[model samples]
Target: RQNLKSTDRAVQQMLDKAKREGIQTVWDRYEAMKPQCGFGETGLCCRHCLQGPCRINPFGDEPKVGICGATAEVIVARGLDRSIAAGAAGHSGHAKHLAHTLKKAVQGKAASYMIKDRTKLHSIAKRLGIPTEGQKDEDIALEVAKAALADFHEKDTPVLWVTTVLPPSRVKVLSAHGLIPAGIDHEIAEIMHRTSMGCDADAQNLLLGGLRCSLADLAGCYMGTDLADILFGTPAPVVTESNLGVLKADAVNVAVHGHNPVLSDIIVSVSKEMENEARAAGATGINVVGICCTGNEVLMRHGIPACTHSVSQEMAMITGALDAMILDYQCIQPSVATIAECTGTTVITTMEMSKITGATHVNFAEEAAVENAKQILRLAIDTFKRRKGKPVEIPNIKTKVVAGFSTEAIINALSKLNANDPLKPLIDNVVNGNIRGVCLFAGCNNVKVPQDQNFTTIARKLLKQNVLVVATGCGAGALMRHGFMDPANVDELCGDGLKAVLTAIGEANGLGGPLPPVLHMGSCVDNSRAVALVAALANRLGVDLDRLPVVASAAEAMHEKAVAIGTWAVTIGLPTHIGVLPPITGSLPVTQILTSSVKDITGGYFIVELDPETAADKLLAAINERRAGLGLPW
Candidate 1:
């Protein structure tokens, strides 16, 4: 019998159904693909050239080179370089789409779009050196949009977005090593050309190329967040619900599943406009729920409930109450269409480039976004009528979460305690013994690991050690699902030092109760929010980022974007930890360069550990080391 137990109870119910019905799931497929190829897992395999598909002998008793005389180091570095390039492409392209939409919005061509946060727009414009003294908002927005798009096309100068957002010391250090990205698309394209057969075979040089591509990834992510905040309004504190229980049996349930919020946000607004249509179809109303980062986007803005995260996305469909699943792009599984078919749910693909063969494709265009959103909702309302008599079962699993802690919201909260200097209260706590350090949890959930187990374990351990925790992406979803974001858990989970700190801040902010031990920062791309916070803290201390007692962890990372994120985390001077073993472990030199040697160059490195408690201990050790460097009591 297949095991029905999971870290999430809502997922357990679906796992039980999959087993009883002999239906395949991610876990089933993972088992079926058992005993995976060792060479590929270790990054010792190469198929870069048509001349040969090569594998290096792990035992070292056979051939040590590929057909083209490429060593394991060269092959592994190239593979990693290409992965970074692909990841860069994903983020940069997403940013490009948003930039294009902003261009349309500013030009008054996008009827549904407007500048939601004028202050944010002005802030970004000032940072980009675009004059806003006597310019109209539209004119300033047009300039900002053009400036953002220029990052993809600039020839010699580094991407303006990267140079503008990062701290000056970081820019200088990166530029000294020739790691600053020239352009987003430029860096990605160069990596592909360099990794091609018989080109740039030196392992060290290939690794450097990986660093440059990863910087491009960082630049793209920062640009995405900056422009999104300007267009969508920077997120502030909001209360929301999470888990499969957010799906309603009486409403025409539609889940927004993807990364970008351009279309998803409009669908949210349009759902409210068409609630009567849903009620006419024998339902209470249209319940718009979030599924992934797209969920994070709407949840942060509109207080929408989050139905599911990465690994359990299909489980949301298994509830049988969902009328439709609307997708944009990134981290969406192909197998979801199969689940939708059995559940009688409609699967709608909105993006032109992300169409599934069997799913309904409704072209989403910026100029006609309002009309497109209406049509999509109309389809969901119709689908709800068709699935009327089906036995719908939604797991009774959800927790109240206090999300939307944007960088602005966090500072505003601290401002209540110290009017003149908001960051001083936080800095004082770190200097004293009340708060030891900070950890930002980011990345996806992998089927190889039990859902939410690592994140919960590691976060709780660190919390008890007086670490301030922040989370984004699926990591935030995992913690929210487990009640980690519930204010009641703070008293139970936090150390005495941390508990007092949270209670003081919470009371000053009029929360009545303590803030949750873990703060929910937004989606994956909002990792830029975490970096911005850190840069401010580093600048406040008059030291570079490396001297700060801060770190990042991707305990259950499962995407190429996560890899790029981790690399750039290290590149920007934060010691990053990953629980899963990456493919670079086979190449000793490559692994050494990443985990050790890079520290000397960039003041950051990777820590690979599987056990949550062990990882917490290592992070604490690193934090204490930084504290000593700052001459603070460790």
Candidate 2:
């Protein structure tokens, strides 16, 4: 039997059942693909043009050039550029979708959508320099949407959303290197065009193109967060639960997967309304649970229980309790349809661009959101009835988590400590060495790594060193599932310094208990929230983000979006650690530029280490180095 020590006990139990039933899973597929291709892993292979599916010899025995005479540098840069472009496309497209929905809502075209956070709407309007004086909320929202939509189309101007959110000094640095993106779509297209056979031959130039596209990725993430908060209302502290045990056997269990919250929010509302219909079908009610980043979205806003994260997505269905799985886009594994086939679960695709074969297509539109949500729930109720006699096994494991710490919520909490100067308390803690620094954990679970192993190990080590922790996406899910977000863990796991700070803040915020060691900042796109928080700190200290003793770790990263996110994390001047070695190690110059020389340019560099403990040491050392530079206690 394969070992189950890599993951939580709950996942291990389900994996055993999956094996008993002869159901194939991600782990099984990973085993089948073992001794994987070295060329692909090292980014030495290139297939950009028809002239070559070219690969370089890592050893000195074979030709180092492709059929088109592309060297390792050219090939690696092109591959990396394309990956950045794809990542930018995924996030920018998500941002565009939200912008479109907001536009529709402003025009009274979307029946179920309205401005949920008027204050945020006005905040964005004021920042974008759009006139909100004497204007209706709809008018301000429309102008904001128009401004956001322009970033996808404008060619000569750097993305307004990006330029507005980033520090002036950072913008100047990016512009000096010609790395500031002119537009989101424009930069992504340029990367695709430049990487196509023999277009951009210089390795350094190609890498710059990659950086430009990465900035577009950051712009997309920032705009997505801003627009989502305005529409969904900024997330605040909320108590929730996570894990497969959140699934209800007697209820119509519907899992909302994927990244976008636009549809998932409506589904939650409609699920509540359809409770009577669900009970009429002999079920307790319609139980809506979250999966993946979409789960992060609703769990942050509506206190919806998270059922599973990236790698364990299909395992949620293995419980045999999931009546329907509704997906929008991004981080959704298409193999879910296959799992649904065996488990008798209904898989529903909502986006027109994202359709799985053999899955029901319900083309979700903002205008028909209410009707579409009801229809989706009706399908789930029917599936629940059909599966009534099937054996269901839900592992009795769930963790209590306090989530929904947005930038505003964090500031509000800190304001409780120092009403006159909100950021002073955190800055004072950092200055006084009561808190060593801040570390933001982001990214996904790689099947190649034991799920949550790296994140948990590294976080515990860092917390003991008094590093304040913040997390988003599946990293947050992993921590929430494993008890890092449980308030009671503060005294159990935190260092004396961190425990004191958390308790002080907790009491100040009226929690009447210690705060969890890790703060949950929304979804993957909401990594932008962490960026904003750091920028706020930097602004307060009269420095740039690079000078702060803050770092970001994507310990178990598994997606192209993770690449995009990490690239920008470095681009915006924070030391970024990745537990999984990236694919550019084959090119010495490219790898050197990323890990060493980039620090000279952007004040941030990549740390590649596989051992979580060693990675934690490197991160803490980096934090200390920055702290020492700033004349702070280290």
In order, the Cα lDDT scores of the candidates are 0.88, 0.91
How much is 424 displaced in model 1, in angstroms?
1.1
Model 1 lDDT tens row, 276-332: 888888999999999989999899888899998998888888788889999999999
In angstroms, how far off is 320's CA in candidate 1? 0.8
Provide the lDDT at 29 for model 2: 87
lDDT of 1 at 374: 92
Compared with the true structure, what per-residue lDDT tens digits does model 2 show for residues 7-28?
7778888898899999999998
Model 2 misplacement above 4 A? 1-5
Regions more than 4 Å wrong, model 1 = 1-5
Q: Pairing residues by index, what is the TM-score of model 1?
A: 0.98
